[PDB]
Amino acid sequence: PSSREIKRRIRSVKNVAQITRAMEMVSASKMRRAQRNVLATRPYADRMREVMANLTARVVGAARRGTLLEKRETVKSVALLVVTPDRGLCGSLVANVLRRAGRFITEQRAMGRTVDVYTFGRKGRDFFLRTGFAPAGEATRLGDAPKLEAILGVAISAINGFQSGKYDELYIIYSEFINTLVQRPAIKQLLPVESPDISTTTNVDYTYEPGEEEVLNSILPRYVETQIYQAVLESIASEHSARMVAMRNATNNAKDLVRDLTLSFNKARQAAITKEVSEIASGAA
Amino acid sequence: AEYFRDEGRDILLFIDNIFRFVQAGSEVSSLLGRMPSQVGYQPTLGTEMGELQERITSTKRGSITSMQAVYVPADDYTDPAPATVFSHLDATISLERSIAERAIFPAVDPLASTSRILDPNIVGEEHYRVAQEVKRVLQRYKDLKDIIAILGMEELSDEDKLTVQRARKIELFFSQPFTVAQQFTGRPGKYVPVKKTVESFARLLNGEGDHIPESFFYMQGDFDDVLAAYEASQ
């Protein structure tokens, strides 16, 4: 506080404000393109949604409700999927999703179900490595526009684990994009338990050339992979939105601190001028 | 006081705003035609200060337990009067405007407050360890203050985040209701013995009370009162 250190501080926080505003702008463009990608992925997702509803409408017997469609009893092992940002600055989003994952692990262990972690994004990977859980499936360096082929390394592993009895149920934790400003973590069930939607009510009778059971066993894994891809893209959009909000708040805070530091600098400047003129007047007299 | 000190009686000496002693000296010196030193202060500032303060001493015949108060012009701690006072003390306490504005009314700044007998041989090893840890943690928070201010709490590491939360709890916990200040804060005064203070802060640093929200450390006695308040709040 010597009217020169405060000047350096003011310059520093001004640089912070400029960098943060630039981050907010690029995060806005990122959110735009991520929303575009989500909407471009929407047709596959919803078409397969009503296709699955129609298929499970016909497959109603317990005997043929096997493989991925079976509603297993006496659940023993549960796998949860977590999608997290690869980088920080997201604000409370990473903390929120990891708190949700931790508490969900708490209830799943409360009922006696052993839990295994499958993580997208470096933040969740690092957190779960530090806390103790070894990543059963690890996938990082997912860009803002990931391809479905990039998720296979985890999704196929989870589906094979469920098929082999390793996991009796499957979950995903992702950041839902409620608004441009408001985002919460969400929980979804990955064992199908499909909805008796209008499609399920639809009685359009079909023909299954390779076979009903074969079509079922070939479409359930792809439906699950589509759900995971939707969740990952939703999480990417929420990541960019949360970074936008965090950087807007940081820019506003930096501007407020620049204002306060400018007030302090002006006070120091006036004090320095008063001190020097008082000393000069004393020396003259 | 010196008469009673010399005959062996233990004396408690309370002098208020030694700064007005220095200020009156400055005004008298200005009227006396002396050349002003630094900020309009008397050239004989150190000598007058020493003449007053070297008589405030516990000698072999008897002891004086002096407990002064000092007013810093506005919030200036580099002013010549407190600057000369600081070297004339065994225990220094600094009251900050910012802490008082937060209603943490005892308002003592732990980082700017020191004492000569904060040594494990005199005050005890556990007391010294707890105090030094409560200053280290307080420092970490002062270093991360700007990082928290602009960016936010989430960019800190997990251990930095934990130490920041513990530092805020410690700041709130130094608040204490006083019997004489019952008019301002409706809470009755609390007399916390030094042993209970050491135990409370050792428990706070150990990790106990981490789950408690920081709002329950405000204007409480020892850690047991905080635990009781939390339990009553469930």
Side-chain angles (χ1 to χ4, degrees), chain A residues 79-114:
Chain A
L80 78 172
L81 271 290
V82 290
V83 57
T84 55
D86 308 284
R87 290 182 291 110
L89 303 182
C90 297
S92 61
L93 184 143
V94 185
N96 286 358
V97 297
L98 295 177
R99 273 208 298 109
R100 186 64 181 273
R103 67 184 291 276
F104 177 76
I105 282 167
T106 304
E107 291 91 8
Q108 293 301 290
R109 295 282 179 80
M111 293 184 76
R113 321 176 190 186
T114 188

PDB file of all heavy atoms in Angstrom, chain A residues 79-114:
ATOM      1  N   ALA A  79     -23.077 -50.650 -10.520  1.00  0.00           N
ATOM      2  CA  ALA A  79     -22.104 -49.784 -11.168  1.00  0.00           C
ATOM      3  C   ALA A  79     -22.741 -48.433 -11.459  1.00  0.00           C
ATOM      4  O   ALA A  79     -23.898 -48.361 -11.883  1.00  0.00           O
ATOM      5  CB  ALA A  79     -21.585 -50.411 -12.461  1.00  0.00           C
ATOM      6  N   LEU A  80     -21.987 -47.366 -11.216  1.00  0.00           N
ATOM      7  CA  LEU A  80     -22.441 -46.006 -11.466  1.00  0.00           C
ATOM      8  C   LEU A  80     -21.480 -45.322 -12.426  1.00  0.00           C
ATOM      9  O   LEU A  80     -20.257 -45.422 -12.284  1.00  0.00           O
ATOM     10  CB  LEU A  80     -22.556 -45.200 -10.158  1.00  0.00           C
ATOM     11  CG  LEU A  80     -21.287 -44.635  -9.507  1.00  0.00           C
ATOM     12  CD1 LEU A  80     -21.638 -43.712  -8.354  1.00  0.00           C
ATOM     13  CD2 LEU A  80     -20.381 -45.751  -9.038  1.00  0.00           C
ATOM     14  N   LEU A  81     -22.049 -44.627 -13.404  1.00  0.00           N
ATOM     15  CA  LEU A  81     -21.287 -43.877 -14.390  1.00  0.00           C
ATOM     16  C   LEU A  81     -21.292 -42.409 -13.995  1.00  0.00           C
ATOM     17  O   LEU A  81     -22.345 -41.858 -13.659  1.00  0.00           O
ATOM     18  CB  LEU A  81     -21.878 -44.053 -15.791  1.00  0.00           C
ATOM     19  CG  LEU A  81     -21.377 -45.231 -16.633  1.00  0.00           C
ATOM     20  CD1 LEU A  81     -19.935 -45.039 -17.077  1.00  0.00           C
ATOM     21  CD2 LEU A  81     -21.535 -46.537 -15.874  1.00  0.00           C
ATOM     22  N   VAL A  82     -20.119 -41.784 -14.016  1.00  0.00           N
ATOM     23  CA  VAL A  82     -19.974 -40.371 -13.695  1.00  0.00           C
ATOM     24  C   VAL A  82     -19.301 -39.684 -14.871  1.00  0.00           C
ATOM     25  O   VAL A  82     -18.280 -40.160 -15.380  1.00  0.00           O
ATOM     26  CB  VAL A  82     -19.168 -40.143 -12.397  1.00  0.00           C
ATOM     27  CG1 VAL A  82     -19.972 -40.583 -11.187  1.00  0.00           C
ATOM     28  CG2 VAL A  82     -17.817 -40.850 -12.450  1.00  0.00           C
ATOM     29  N   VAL A  83     -19.883 -38.574 -15.309  1.00  0.00           N
ATOM     30  CA  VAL A  83     -19.315 -37.734 -16.356  1.00  0.00           C
ATOM     31  C   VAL A  83     -18.978 -36.395 -15.721  1.00  0.00           C
ATOM     32  O   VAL A  83     -19.838 -35.766 -15.092  1.00  0.00           O
ATOM     33  CB  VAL A  83     -20.268 -37.574 -17.554  1.00  0.00           C
ATOM     34  CG1 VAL A  83     -21.620 -36.999 -17.131  1.00  0.00           C
ATOM     35  CG2 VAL A  83     -19.628 -36.713 -18.635  1.00  0.00           C
ATOM     36  N   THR A  84     -17.729 -35.975 -15.863  1.00  0.00           N
ATOM     37  CA  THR A  84     -17.213 -34.769 -15.238  1.00  0.00           C
ATOM     38  C   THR A  84     -16.428 -33.956 -16.255  1.00  0.00           C
ATOM     39  O   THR A  84     -15.952 -34.495 -17.259  1.00  0.00           O
ATOM     40  CB  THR A  84     -16.307 -35.108 -14.047  1.00  0.00           C
ATOM     41  OG1 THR A  84     -15.267 -35.998 -14.472  1.00  0.00           O
ATOM     42  CG2 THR A  84     -17.107 -35.763 -12.936  1.00  0.00           C
ATOM     43  N   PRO A  85     -16.284 -32.648 -16.031  1.00  0.00           N
ATOM     44  CA  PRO A  85     -15.406 -31.854 -16.893  1.00  0.00           C
ATOM     45  C   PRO A  85     -13.969 -32.349 -16.841  1.00  0.00           C
ATOM     46  O   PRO A  85     -13.488 -32.823 -15.811  1.00  0.00           O
ATOM     47  CB  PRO A  85     -15.523 -30.441 -16.315  1.00  0.00           C
ATOM     48  CG  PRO A  85     -16.834 -30.419 -15.638  1.00  0.00           C
ATOM     49  CD  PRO A  85     -17.075 -31.797 -15.125  1.00  0.00           C
ATOM     50  N   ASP A  86     -13.282 -32.233 -17.978  1.00  0.00           N
ATOM     51  CA  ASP A  86     -11.859 -32.539 -18.022  1.00  0.00           C
ATOM     52  C   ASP A  86     -11.016 -31.448 -17.375  1.00  0.00           C
ATOM     53  O   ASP A  86      -9.898 -31.729 -16.931  1.00  0.00           O
ATOM     54  CB  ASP A  86     -11.408 -32.747 -19.467  1.00  0.00           C
ATOM     55  CG  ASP A  86     -12.264 -33.753 -20.208  1.00  0.00           C
ATOM     56  OD1 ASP A  86     -12.097 -34.966 -19.969  1.00  0.00           O
ATOM     57  OD2 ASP A  86     -13.105 -33.331 -21.028  1.00  0.00           O
ATOM     58  N   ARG A  87     -11.525 -30.218 -17.315  1.00  0.00           N
ATOM     59  CA  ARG A  87     -10.802 -29.074 -16.780  1.00  0.00           C
ATOM     60  C   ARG A  87     -11.646 -28.397 -15.709  1.00  0.00           C
ATOM     61  O   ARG A  87     -12.857 -28.612 -15.606  1.00  0.00           O
ATOM     62  CB  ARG A  87     -10.446 -28.074 -17.887  1.00  0.00           C
ATOM     63  CG  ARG A  87      -9.386 -28.574 -18.850  1.00  0.00           C
ATOM     64  CD  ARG A  87      -9.048 -27.524 -19.894  1.00  0.00           C
ATOM     65  NE  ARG A  87     -10.155 -27.321 -20.826  1.00  0.00           N
ATOM     66  CZ  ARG A  87     -10.924 -26.240 -20.901  1.00  0.00           C
ATOM     67  NH1 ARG A  87     -10.767 -25.207 -20.087  1.00  0.00           N
ATOM     68  NH2 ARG A  87     -11.886 -26.197 -21.818  1.00  0.00           N
ATOM     69  N   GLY A  88     -10.989 -27.565 -14.908  1.00  0.00           N
ATOM     70  CA  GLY A  88     -11.641 -26.867 -13.817  1.00  0.00           C
ATOM     71  C   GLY A  88     -12.362 -25.620 -14.278  1.00  0.00           C
ATOM     72  O   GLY A  88     -12.806 -25.515 -15.427  1.00  0.00           O
ATOM     73  N   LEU A  89     -12.492 -24.663 -13.362  1.00  0.00           N
ATOM     74  CA  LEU A  89     -13.171 -23.388 -13.571  1.00  0.00           C
ATOM     75  C   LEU A  89     -14.672 -23.541 -13.782  1.00  0.00           C
ATOM     76  O   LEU A  89     -15.341 -22.567 -14.143  1.00  0.00           O
ATOM     77  CB  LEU A  89     -12.574 -22.614 -14.755  1.00  0.00           C
ATOM     78  CG  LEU A  89     -11.082 -22.292 -14.726  1.00  0.00           C
ATOM     79  CD1 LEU A  89     -10.716 -21.488 -15.963  1.00  0.00           C
ATOM     80  CD2 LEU A  89     -10.700 -21.542 -13.460  1.00  0.00           C
ATOM     81  N   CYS A  90     -15.226 -24.732 -13.564  1.00  0.00           N
ATOM     82  CA  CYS A  90     -16.650 -24.947 -13.778  1.00  0.00           C
ATOM     83  C   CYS A  90     -17.504 -24.453 -12.622  1.00  0.00           C
ATOM     84  O   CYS A  90     -18.734 -24.481 -12.731  1.00  0.00           O
ATOM     85  CB  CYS A  90     -16.925 -26.432 -14.007  1.00  0.00           C
ATOM     86  SG  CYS A  90     -16.139 -27.089 -15.484  1.00  0.00           S
ATOM     87  N   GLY A  91     -16.897 -24.008 -11.532  1.00  0.00           N
ATOM     88  CA  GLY A  91     -17.656 -23.588 -10.367  1.00  0.00           C
ATOM     89  C   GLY A  91     -18.031 -24.779  -9.513  1.00  0.00           C
ATOM     90  O   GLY A  91     -17.211 -25.668  -9.284  1.00  0.00           O
ATOM     91  N   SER A  92     -19.276 -24.801  -9.051  1.00  0.00           N
ATOM     92  CA  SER A  92     -19.753 -25.861  -8.174  1.00  0.00           C
ATOM     93  C   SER A  92     -20.206 -27.105  -8.929  1.00  0.00           C
ATOM     94  O   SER A  92     -20.624 -28.074  -8.286  1.00  0.00           O
ATOM     95  CB  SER A  92     -20.903 -25.337  -7.313  1.00  0.00           C
ATOM     96  OG  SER A  92     -21.989 -24.920  -8.121  1.00  0.00           O
ATOM     97  N   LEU A  93     -20.140 -27.103 -10.262  1.00  0.00           N
ATOM     98  CA  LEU A  93     -20.635 -28.241 -11.030  1.00  0.00           C
ATOM     99  C   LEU A  93     -19.880 -29.519 -10.689  1.00  0.00           C
ATOM    100  O   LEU A  93     -20.498 -30.554 -10.409  1.00  0.00           O
ATOM    101  CB  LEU A  93     -20.533 -27.935 -12.524  1.00  0.00           C
ATOM    102  CG  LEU A  93     -21.088 -28.981 -13.493  1.00  0.00           C
ATOM    103  CD1 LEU A  93     -21.751 -28.300 -14.676  1.00  0.00           C
ATOM    104  CD2 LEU A  93     -19.997 -29.927 -13.983  1.00  0.00           C
ATOM    105  N   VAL A  94     -18.547 -29.468 -10.702  1.00  0.00           N
ATOM    106  CA  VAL A  94     -17.760 -30.659 -10.390  1.00  0.00           C
ATOM    107  C   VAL A  94     -18.022 -31.096  -8.956  1.00  0.00           C
ATOM    108  O   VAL A  94     -18.222 -32.284  -8.675  1.00  0.00           O
ATOM    109  CB  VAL A  94     -16.263 -30.394 -10.634  1.00  0.00           C
ATOM    110  CG1 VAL A  94     -15.453 -31.666 -10.416  1.00  0.00           C
ATOM    111  CG2 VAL A  94     -16.044 -29.838 -12.032  1.00  0.00           C
ATOM    112  N   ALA A  95     -18.032 -30.139  -8.028  1.00  0.00           N
ATOM    113  CA  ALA A  95     -18.302 -30.466  -6.635  1.00  0.00           C
ATOM    114  C   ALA A  95     -19.697 -31.052  -6.474  1.00  0.00           C
ATOM    115  O   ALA A  95     -19.891 -32.002  -5.713  1.00  0.00           O
ATOM    116  CB  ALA A  95     -18.139 -29.224  -5.761  1.00  0.00           C
ATOM    117  N   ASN A  96     -20.680 -30.505  -7.190  1.00  0.00           N
ATOM    118  CA  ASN A  96     -22.043 -31.011  -7.078  1.00  0.00           C
ATOM    119  C   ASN A  96     -22.144 -32.447  -7.580  1.00  0.00           C
ATOM    120  O   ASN A  96     -22.716 -33.312  -6.903  1.00  0.00           O
ATOM    121  CB  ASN A  96     -23.000 -30.106  -7.851  1.00  0.00           C
ATOM    122  CG  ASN A  96     -23.249 -28.787  -7.150  1.00  0.00           C
ATOM    123  OD1 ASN A  96     -22.741 -28.548  -6.055  1.00  0.00           O
ATOM    124  ND2 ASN A  96     -24.030 -27.920  -7.781  1.00  0.00           N
ATOM    125  N   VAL A  97     -21.594 -32.723  -8.766  1.00  0.00           N
ATOM    126  CA  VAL A  97     -21.704 -34.077  -9.304  1.00  0.00           C
ATOM    127  C   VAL A  97     -20.943 -35.061  -8.429  1.00  0.00           C
ATOM    128  O   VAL A  97     -21.409 -36.183  -8.200  1.00  0.00           O
ATOM    129  CB  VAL A  97     -21.228 -34.151 -10.770  1.00  0.00           C
ATOM    130  CG1 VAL A  97     -22.104 -33.287 -11.664  1.00  0.00           C
ATOM    131  CG2 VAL A  97     -19.767 -33.762 -10.911  1.00  0.00           C
ATOM    132  N   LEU A  98     -19.775 -34.672  -7.912  1.00  0.00           N
ATOM    133  CA  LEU A  98     -19.023 -35.598  -7.077  1.00  0.00           C
ATOM    134  C   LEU A  98     -19.677 -35.800  -5.718  1.00  0.00           C
ATOM    135  O   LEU A  98     -19.613 -36.904  -5.171  1.00  0.00           O
ATOM    136  CB  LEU A  98     -17.585 -35.110  -6.914  1.00  0.00           C
ATOM    137  CG  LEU A  98     -16.762 -35.084  -8.205  1.00  0.00           C
ATOM    138  CD1 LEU A  98     -15.383 -34.507  -7.943  1.00  0.00           C
ATOM    139  CD2 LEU A  98     -16.655 -36.465  -8.834  1.00  0.00           C
ATOM    140  N   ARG A  99     -20.318 -34.771  -5.163  1.00  0.00           N
ATOM    141  CA  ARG A  99     -21.093 -34.966  -3.943  1.00  0.00           C
ATOM    142  C   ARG A  99     -22.245 -35.928  -4.186  1.00  0.00           C
ATOM    143  O   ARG A  99     -22.521 -36.801  -3.352  1.00  0.00           O
ATOM    144  CB  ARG A  99     -21.620 -33.626  -3.432  1.00  0.00           C
ATOM    145  CG  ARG A  99     -20.663 -32.875  -2.520  1.00  0.00           C
ATOM    146  CD  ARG A  99     -21.416 -31.980  -1.550  1.00  0.00           C
ATOM    147  NE  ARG A  99     -22.191 -30.955  -2.244  1.00  0.00           N
ATOM    148  CZ  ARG A  99     -23.516 -30.912  -2.342  1.00  0.00           C
ATOM    149  NH1 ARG A  99     -24.291 -31.853  -1.823  1.00  0.00           N
ATOM    150  NH2 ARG A  99     -24.084 -29.898  -2.989  1.00  0.00           N
ATOM    151  N   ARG A 100     -22.933 -35.781  -5.321  1.00  0.00           N
ATOM    152  CA  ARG A 100     -24.022 -36.700  -5.631  1.00  0.00           C
ATOM    153  C   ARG A 100     -23.506 -38.125  -5.782  1.00  0.00           C
ATOM    154  O   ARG A 100     -24.120 -39.070  -5.274  1.00  0.00           O
ATOM    155  CB  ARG A 100     -24.749 -36.252  -6.900  1.00  0.00           C
ATOM    156  CG  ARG A 100     -26.000 -37.064  -7.241  1.00  0.00           C
ATOM    157  CD  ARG A 100     -27.086 -36.934  -6.180  1.00  0.00           C
ATOM    158  NE  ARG A 100     -28.266 -37.733  -6.494  1.00  0.00           N
ATOM    159  CZ  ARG A 100     -29.285 -37.329  -7.241  1.00  0.00           C
ATOM    160  NH1 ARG A 100     -29.303 -36.133  -7.807  1.00  0.00           N
ATOM    161  NH2 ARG A 100     -30.315 -38.149  -7.426  1.00  0.00           N
ATOM    162  N   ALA A 101     -22.373 -38.299  -6.463  1.00  0.00           N
ATOM    163  CA  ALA A 101     -21.802 -39.633  -6.616  1.00  0.00           C
ATOM    164  C   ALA A 101     -21.400 -40.219  -5.269  1.00  0.00           C
ATOM    165  O   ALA A 101     -21.654 -41.398  -4.999  1.00  0.00           O
ATOM    166  CB  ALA A 101     -20.599 -39.585  -7.554  1.00  0.00           C
ATOM    167  N   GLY A 102     -20.775 -39.414  -4.410  1.00  0.00           N
ATOM    168  CA  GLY A 102     -20.361 -39.915  -3.111  1.00  0.00           C
ATOM    169  C   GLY A 102     -21.536 -40.327  -2.247  1.00  0.00           C
ATOM    170  O   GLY A 102     -21.529 -41.407  -1.648  1.00  0.00           O
ATOM    171  N   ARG A 103     -22.570 -39.486  -2.177  1.00  0.00           N
ATOM    172  CA  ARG A 103     -23.727 -39.869  -1.380  1.00  0.00           C
ATOM    173  C   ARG A 103     -24.440 -41.076  -1.975  1.00  0.00           C
ATOM    174  O   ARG A 103     -24.872 -41.952  -1.223  1.00  0.00           O
ATOM    175  CB  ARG A 103     -24.696 -38.695  -1.224  1.00  0.00           C
ATOM    176  CG  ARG A 103     -25.384 -38.256  -2.491  1.00  0.00           C
ATOM    177  CD  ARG A 103     -26.232 -37.025  -2.248  1.00  0.00           C
ATOM    178  NE  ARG A 103     -27.390 -37.327  -1.414  1.00  0.00           N
ATOM    179  CZ  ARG A 103     -28.537 -37.823  -1.860  1.00  0.00           C
ATOM    180  NH1 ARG A 103     -28.721 -38.111  -3.138  1.00  0.00           N
ATOM    181  NH2 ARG A 103     -29.525 -38.042  -0.998  1.00  0.00           N
ATOM    182  N   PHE A 104     -24.553 -41.157  -3.305  1.00  0.00           N
ATOM    183  CA  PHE A 104     -25.159 -42.335  -3.914  1.00  0.00           C
ATOM    184  C   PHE A 104     -24.373 -43.591  -3.567  1.00  0.00           C
ATOM    185  O   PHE A 104     -24.964 -44.635  -3.273  1.00  0.00           O
ATOM    186  CB  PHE A 104     -25.245 -42.158  -5.428  1.00  0.00           C
ATOM    187  CG  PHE A 104     -25.801 -43.352  -6.145  1.00  0.00           C
ATOM    188  CD1 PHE A 104     -27.157 -43.623  -6.128  1.00  0.00           C
ATOM    189  CD2 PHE A 104     -24.961 -44.209  -6.835  1.00  0.00           C
ATOM    190  CE1 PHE A 104     -27.664 -44.724  -6.789  1.00  0.00           C
ATOM    191  CE2 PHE A 104     -25.461 -45.308  -7.497  1.00  0.00           C
ATOM    192  CZ  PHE A 104     -26.814 -45.568  -7.474  1.00  0.00           C
ATOM    193  N   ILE A 105     -23.042 -43.506  -3.592  1.00  0.00           N
ATOM    194  CA  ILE A 105     -22.221 -44.619  -3.132  1.00  0.00           C
ATOM    195  C   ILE A 105     -22.555 -44.945  -1.684  1.00  0.00           C
ATOM    196  O   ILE A 105     -22.589 -46.116  -1.285  1.00  0.00           O
ATOM    197  CB  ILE A 105     -20.728 -44.286  -3.312  1.00  0.00           C
ATOM    198  CG1 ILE A 105     -20.326 -44.456  -4.780  1.00  0.00           C
ATOM    199  CG2 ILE A 105     -19.854 -45.169  -2.406  1.00  0.00           C
ATOM    200  CD1 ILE A 105     -18.979 -43.859  -5.132  1.00  0.00           C
ATOM    201  N   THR A 106     -22.800 -43.913  -0.873  1.00  0.00           N
ATOM    202  CA  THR A 106     -23.120 -44.143   0.532  1.00  0.00           C
ATOM    203  C   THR A 106     -24.401 -44.959   0.678  1.00  0.00           C
ATOM    204  O   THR A 106     -24.434 -45.943   1.424  1.00  0.00           O
ATOM    205  CB  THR A 106     -23.239 -42.811   1.278  1.00  0.00           C
ATOM    206  OG1 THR A 106     -22.031 -42.059   1.119  1.00  0.00           O
ATOM    207  CG2 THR A 106     -23.483 -43.049   2.759  1.00  0.00           C
ATOM    208  N   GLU A 107     -25.470 -44.577  -0.034  1.00  0.00           N
ATOM    209  CA  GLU A 107     -26.692 -45.380   0.092  1.00  0.00           C
ATOM    210  C   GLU A 107     -26.519 -46.768  -0.509  1.00  0.00           C
ATOM    211  O   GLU A 107     -27.036 -47.744   0.045  1.00  0.00           O
ATOM    212  CB  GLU A 107     -27.948 -44.744  -0.531  1.00  0.00           C
ATOM    213  CG  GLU A 107     -28.506 -43.486   0.162  1.00  0.00           C
ATOM    214  CD  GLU A 107     -27.971 -42.181  -0.363  1.00  0.00           C
ATOM    215  OE1 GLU A 107     -27.269 -42.202  -1.383  1.00  0.00           O
ATOM    216  OE2 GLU A 107     -28.244 -41.130   0.252  1.00  0.00           O
ATOM    217  N   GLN A 108     -25.811 -46.888  -1.636  1.00  0.00           N
ATOM    218  CA  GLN A 108     -25.649 -48.203  -2.250  1.00  0.00           C
ATOM    219  C   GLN A 108     -24.857 -49.145  -1.354  1.00  0.00           C
ATOM    220  O   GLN A 108     -25.131 -50.350  -1.330  1.00  0.00           O
ATOM    221  CB  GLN A 108     -24.977 -48.073  -3.618  1.00  0.00           C
ATOM    222  CG  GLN A 108     -25.825 -47.369  -4.677  1.00  0.00           C
ATOM    223  CD  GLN A 108     -27.149 -48.056  -4.942  1.00  0.00           C
ATOM    224  OE1 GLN A 108     -27.193 -49.145  -5.510  1.00  0.00           O
ATOM    225  NE2 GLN A 108     -28.240 -47.422  -4.524  1.00  0.00           N
ATOM    226  N   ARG A 109     -23.874 -48.625  -0.619  1.00  0.00           N
ATOM    227  CA  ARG A 109     -23.180 -49.433   0.376  1.00  0.00           C
ATOM    228  C   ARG A 109     -24.010 -49.643   1.635  1.00  0.00           C
ATOM    229  O   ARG A 109     -23.788 -50.627   2.348  1.00  0.00           O
ATOM    230  CB  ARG A 109     -21.844 -48.784   0.742  1.00  0.00           C
ATOM    231  CG  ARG A 109     -20.855 -48.722  -0.411  1.00  0.00           C
ATOM    232  CD  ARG A 109     -20.195 -50.071  -0.638  1.00  0.00           C
ATOM    233  NE  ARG A 109     -19.256 -50.050  -1.755  1.00  0.00           N
ATOM    234  CZ  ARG A 109     -18.015 -49.587  -1.696  1.00  0.00           C
ATOM    235  NH1 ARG A 109     -17.517 -49.069  -0.584  1.00  0.00           N
ATOM    236  NH2 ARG A 109     -17.251 -49.644  -2.783  1.00  0.00           N
ATOM    237  N   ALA A 110     -24.957 -48.746   1.922  1.00  0.00           N
ATOM    238  CA  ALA A 110     -25.808 -48.917   3.095  1.00  0.00           C
ATOM    239  C   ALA A 110     -26.680 -50.158   2.967  1.00  0.00           C
ATOM    240  O   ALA A 110     -26.883 -50.883   3.947  1.00  0.00           O
ATOM    241  CB  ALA A 110     -26.673 -47.675   3.302  1.00  0.00           C
ATOM    242  N   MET A 111     -27.207 -50.416   1.772  1.00  0.00           N
ATOM    243  CA  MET A 111     -28.041 -51.587   1.540  1.00  0.00           C
ATOM    244  C   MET A 111     -27.226 -52.850   1.287  1.00  0.00           C
ATOM    245  O   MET A 111     -27.819 -53.919   1.099  1.00  0.00           O
ATOM    246  CB  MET A 111     -28.982 -51.335   0.359  1.00  0.00           C
ATOM    247  CG  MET A 111     -30.025 -50.263   0.631  1.00  0.00           C
ATOM    248  SD  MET A 111     -31.203 -50.056  -0.718  1.00  0.00           S
ATOM    249  CE  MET A 111     -32.238 -51.500  -0.487  1.00  0.00           C
ATOM    250  N   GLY A 112     -25.900 -52.757   1.273  1.00  0.00           N
ATOM    251  CA  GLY A 112     -25.045 -53.913   1.117  1.00  0.00           C
ATOM    252  C   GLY A 112     -24.594 -54.205  -0.295  1.00  0.00           C
ATOM    253  O   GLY A 112     -24.039 -55.284  -0.534  1.00  0.00           O
ATOM    254  N   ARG A 113     -24.807 -53.287  -1.234  1.00  0.00           N
ATOM    255  CA  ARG A 113     -24.428 -53.496  -2.625  1.00  0.00           C
ATOM    256  C   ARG A 113     -23.032 -52.932  -2.857  1.00  0.00           C
ATOM    257  O   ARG A 113     -22.812 -51.725  -2.704  1.00  0.00           O
ATOM    258  CB  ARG A 113     -25.430 -52.837  -3.575  1.00  0.00           C
ATOM    259  CG  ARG A 113     -26.892 -52.938  -3.156  1.00  0.00           C
ATOM    260  CD  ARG A 113     -27.779 -52.164  -4.115  1.00  0.00           C
ATOM    261  NE  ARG A 113     -29.145 -52.038  -3.623  1.00  0.00           N
ATOM    262  CZ  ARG A 113     -30.147 -51.508  -4.312  1.00  0.00           C
ATOM    263  NH1 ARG A 113     -29.974 -51.028  -5.534  1.00  0.00           N
ATOM    264  NH2 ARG A 113     -31.357 -51.458  -3.762  1.00  0.00           N
ATOM    265  N   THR A 114     -22.093 -53.800  -3.223  1.00  0.00           N
ATOM    266  CA  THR A 114     -20.758 -53.341  -3.576  1.00  0.00           C
ATOM    267  C   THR A 114     -20.828 -52.472  -4.825  1.00  0.00           C
ATOM    268  O   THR A 114     -21.594 -52.753  -5.753  1.00  0.00           O
ATOM    269  CB  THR A 114     -19.821 -54.528  -3.804  1.00  0.00           C
ATOM    270  OG1 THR A 114     -18.479 -54.055  -3.976  1.00  0.00           O
ATOM    271  CG2 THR A 114     -20.232 -55.328  -5.037  1.00  0.00           C
TER     272      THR A 114
END
